[PDB]
Amino acid sequence: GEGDTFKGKLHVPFVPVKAKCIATLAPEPLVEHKHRTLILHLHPDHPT
Amino acid sequence: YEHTAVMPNKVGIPYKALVERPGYAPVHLQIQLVNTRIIPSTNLEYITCKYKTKVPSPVVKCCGATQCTSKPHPDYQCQVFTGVYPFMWGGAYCFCDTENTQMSEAYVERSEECSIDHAKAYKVHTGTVQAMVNITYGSVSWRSADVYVNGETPAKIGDAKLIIGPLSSAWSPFDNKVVVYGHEVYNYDFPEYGTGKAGSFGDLQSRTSTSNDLYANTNLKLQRPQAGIVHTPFTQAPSGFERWKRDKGAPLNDVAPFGCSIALEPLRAENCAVGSIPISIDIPDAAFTRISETPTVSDLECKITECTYASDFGGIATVAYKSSKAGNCPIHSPSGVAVIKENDVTLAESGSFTFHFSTANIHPAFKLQVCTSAVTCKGDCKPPKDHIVDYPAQHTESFT
Numbered sequence: 001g002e003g004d005t006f007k008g009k010l011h012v013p014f015v016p017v018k019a020k021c022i023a024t025l026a027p028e029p030l031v032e033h034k035h036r037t038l039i040l041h042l043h044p045d046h047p048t
Numbered sequence: 049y050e051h052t053a054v055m056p057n058k059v060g061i062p063y064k065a066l067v068e069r070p071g072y073a074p075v076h077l078q079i080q081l082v083n084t085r086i087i088p089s090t091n092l093e094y095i096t097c098k099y100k101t102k103v104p105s106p107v108v109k110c111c112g113a114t115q116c117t118s119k120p121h122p123d124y125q126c127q128v129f130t131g132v133y134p135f136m137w138g139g140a141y142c143f144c145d146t147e148n149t150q151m152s153e154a155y156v157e158r159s160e161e162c163s164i165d166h167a168k169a170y171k172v173h174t175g176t177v178q179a180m181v182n183i184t185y186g187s188v189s190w191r192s193a194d195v196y197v198n199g200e201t202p203a204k205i206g207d208a209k210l211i212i213g214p215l216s217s218a219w220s221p222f223d224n225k226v227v228v229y230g231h232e233v234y235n236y237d238f239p240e241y242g243t244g245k246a247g248s249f250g251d252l253q254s255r256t257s258t259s260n261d262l263y264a265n266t267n268l269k270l271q272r273p274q275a276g277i278v279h280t281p282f283t284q285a286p287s288g289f290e291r292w293k294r295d296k297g298a299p300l301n302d303v304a305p306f307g308c309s310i311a312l313e314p315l316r317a318e319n320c321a322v323g324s325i326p327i328s329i330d331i332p333d334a335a336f337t338r339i340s341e342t343p344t345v346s347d348l349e350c351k352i353t354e355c356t357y358a359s360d361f362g363g364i365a366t367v368a369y370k371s372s373k374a375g376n377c378p379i380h381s382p383s384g385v386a387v388i389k390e391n392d393v394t395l396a397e398s399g400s401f402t403f404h405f406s407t408a409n410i411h412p413a414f415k416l417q418v419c420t421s422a423v424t425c426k427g428d429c430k431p432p433k434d435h436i437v438d439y440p441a442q443h444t445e446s447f448t
């Protein structure tokens with residue numbers, strides 16, 4: 001419009017907030033001890 | 049009674065040592081460090097976040113040009129286009145096929161997510177380190193002290209005062225420049241305030257989240273509207289904060305040496321086990337008892353049983369006490385090669401009682417000490433059968 005910037009602040013209905021989302025839980029690793037060496041068996045379900 | 053000794057800086061391990069005052073029953077200390085907060089100095093430089101290209105509605109005049117003005121908006125990029133013939137809604141907008149002009153305006157504004165999700169640069173100095181310490185000495189069995197590690201400033205909790213530190217090593221995990229993001233921190237070198245290159249980190253910089261003024265070097269460039277359509281096409285580098293959010297390095301929180309954790313609350317490293325602490329405590333006279341009450345324990349013999357070479361309490365031993373009284377008698381090893389499970393032991397009239405210990409040498413020739421007497425508990429040990437353990441409790445490895 002060629003005139004004035006009419007005021008009036010429309011509040012944003014959905015602002016970001018710091019909520020809590022449920023995150024995935026990778027399967028437990030299978031440890032196997034070895035002399036000064038930790039053999040770790042891993043079976044990921046998704047890239048972790 | 050003002051006892052002074054040096055204890056290695058670790059969290060979970062008690063440094064039980066015996067305060068031997070002549071003419072009185074010995075009393076044994078029991079210092080343990082629950083927390084070891086480094087707390088460097090902090091100074092906020094600026095806050096970075098993803099921007100938002102708020103483009104106001106463009107102005108169009110049918111015939112004749114329209115010169116733009118330099119608004120004070122951050123990165124206010126204004127440009128004029130000529131020869132546009134915008135169709136819109138009901139047909140064409142104008143018929144001045146050469147005199148038609150459009151003006152475009154665009155300014156950068158910190159996005160809504162800056163309030164919640166935003167990095168924070170910092171500059172850090174040496175600062176001052178402070179710790180929580182437990183001291184279950186004598187018969188008191190309680191402490192909750194939170195204490196500065198400046199050797200000038202004793203903590204004065206309970207009856208016994210103490211001085212600890214200063215720390216022997218200054219290996220603060222933080223580098224000169226630190227950036228904090230949510231639960232994570234990084235030794236990134238943020239460029240500066242007001243010199244942020246577009247695309248890289250620090251493209252959008254403000255002194256604080258609520259600051260009205262900001263600095264936006266985003267290399268924003270405007271484009272001519274094509275085919276006569278009413279819009280403001282603009283070319284801009286991708287968000288600098290978006291970069292380094294996917295190309296971040298390994299956070300300090302997970303690559304700090306000496307097994308330190310990081311926390312945001314004042315910003316700190318904690319549990320940072322390095323070097324040694326001079327610990328000095330001031331035992332109140334009222335905790336001592338006259339030596340004529342507690343047992344003397346001369347003429348004793350020592351025999352160890354099946355000693356393991358593990359980091360748990362793999363050592364067991366027996367002593368032939370020749371007591372002068374019946375009652376308790378504090379027990380300790382002045383030598384660091386051996387460490388004792390027991391805080392104390394109760395003696396009948398010339399009885400015999402075992403204790404548990406741990407060590408790290410095959411043939412531990414340690415002077416065991418008991419209330420005003422000592423014995424050489426020399427023996428032999430055998431290697432541990434099994435590599436499966438989580439944490440240790442003796443760290444006295446030396447020549448063997």
Ligand SMILES: *[C@@H]1O[C@H](CO)[C@@H](O[C@@H]2O[C@H](CO)[C@@H](O[C@@H]3O[C@H](CO)[C@@H](O)[C@H](O)[C@@H]3O)[C@H](O)[C@H]2NC(C)=O)[C@H](O)[C@H]1NC(C)=O
Pocket residue numbers: 082182183184189190191192
């Ligand atoms: C300072 O060090 C002393 C000595 O290590 C701490 O004493 C011990 O405190 C624990 C709790 O932290 C007591 O645990 C007990 O566990 C059983 C089983 O769950 C429970 O039934 C008891 O109610 C109790 O919680 C433990 O008994 C106690 N030591 C002895 C010999 O009684 C003390 O807590 C430390 N103080 C601080 C503030 O860290």
